[PDB]
């Protein structure tokens, strides 16, 4: 959908005479702007409570910034998704440095491995896998081994002129 921010969105059930101070509910929401983010909020709230934007009000919208934006973290991700022929629950683990980064490549991954466009996905939970060895998926366990080192074979430099006088070398 874009390059995501993450927002706390708070809303509540338009007050009444007999019920002033209604309950207040929050969602974290991954979205590109606060306009999409409020939309999304109402999209899920009408999936859980009896409200709709018409009869409800947004209270606060705030961007949650990453706690330690330069610490490599192991995220486990839970997702709900719609395939062509029925709907489905998933767990992936994504390793990056912010939840916002992580959700960017989830969405990419759903799109590419399952052909799921952004409309058809529901993030269920995104949560930092605290202690390793709770990391489940091997395409991540892989990167957690001690003294890790790997080469990058077969180097392609990007040419800037159309012609070259060398013959290249993919050494590295």
């Amino acid at each position: 959908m874009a390059h995501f921010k993450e927002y706390q969105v708070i809303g509540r059930r338009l007050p009444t005479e007999s019920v002033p101070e209604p309950k207040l509910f929050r969602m974290r929401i991954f979205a590109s702007n606060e306009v999409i983010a409020k939309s999304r909020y109402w999209y899920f709230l009408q999936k859980l409570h009896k409200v709709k934007k018409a009869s409800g009000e947004i209270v606060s919208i705030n961007q949650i910034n990453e706690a330690h934006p330069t610490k490599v973290k192991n995220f486990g991700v839970w997702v709900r998704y719609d395939s062509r022929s029925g709907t489905h629950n998933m767990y992936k683990e994504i390793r990056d440095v912010s939840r916002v980064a992580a959700v960017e490549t989830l969405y990419q991954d759903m799109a590419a491995r399952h052909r799921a466009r952004f409309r058809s996905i529901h993030i269920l939970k995104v949560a930092e896998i605290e202690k390793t060895a709770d990391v489940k998926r091997q395409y991540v366990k892989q990167f957690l081994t001690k003294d890790l080192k790997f080469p990058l074979p077969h180097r392609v430099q990007k040419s800037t002129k159309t012609f070259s006088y060398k013959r290249p070398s993919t050494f590295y």
């Binding site: 077969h154 392609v156 040419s159 159309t162 012609f163 070259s164 006088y165 060398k166 013959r167 290249p168 993919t170």
Partner: protein, 197 residues
């Protein structure tokens, strides 16, 4: 950049080589392509062989002459690739193609002239390693080209002489480098180092 650019076909991908060669022409740049038998095509030999036979069946039903002509030589396989990238029925089109020449091997003039390469068409920079690919010479000879063996012969001969040339050259540049090294440390030498030379 140069009055004439000679490209070594070897290790280049047909359609990427074609795509850049076409644009160069249209922009006024004379080009000669060489060693076209050592051109590459993505996909295993059998595929590009079948692909060839599909081309091979299209002919004018009433007169196989007037219908589409099938050239079997690697240069000319290549020229097909090109001409398709050039509005070749306009005068401007004919104009640009006349700036073009393709050859199997490296015949006179061009064999003592330097040849360049075209990185954005170089197979070894482009194909993901592991993918199967094809050599024109091999394809062409499988569709009737007569002259693979001769080209091999002549090149190997050419290829001998030029290693002489080189080795002789490599030896003189060693002298030159030796000559350069006494000049190192001299005033003029330190001065030029200041100015980035």
């Amino acid at each position: 950049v140069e009055p004439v650019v000679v490209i070594d076909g070897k290790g280049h991908l047909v359609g990427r080589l074609a795509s850049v060669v076409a644009k160069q022409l249209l922009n006024g740049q004379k080009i000669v392509v060489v060693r076209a038998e050592e051109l590459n095509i993505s996909g295993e030999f059998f595929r590009n062989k079948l692909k060839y036979h599909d081309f091979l069946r299209k002919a004018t039903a009433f007169n196989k002459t007037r219908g589409p002509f099938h050239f079997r030589a690697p240069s000319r396989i290549f020229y097909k690739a090109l001409r398709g990238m050039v509005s070749h029925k306009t005068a401007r089109g004919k104009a640009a193609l006349e700036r073009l020449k393709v050859f199997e091997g490296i015949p006179p003039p061009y064999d003592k002239k330097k040849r360049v390469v075209v990185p954005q068409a170089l197979r070894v920079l482009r194909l993901k390693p592991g993918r199967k690919y094809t050599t024109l010479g091999k394809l062409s000879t499988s569709v009737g080209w007569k002259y693979e063996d001769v080209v091999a012969k002549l090149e190997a001969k050419r290829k001998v002489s030029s290693a002489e040339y080189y080795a002789k050259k490599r030896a003189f540049t060693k002298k030159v480098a030796s000559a350069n090294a006494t000049a190192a440390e001299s005033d003029v030498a330190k001065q030029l180092a200041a100015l980035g030379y």
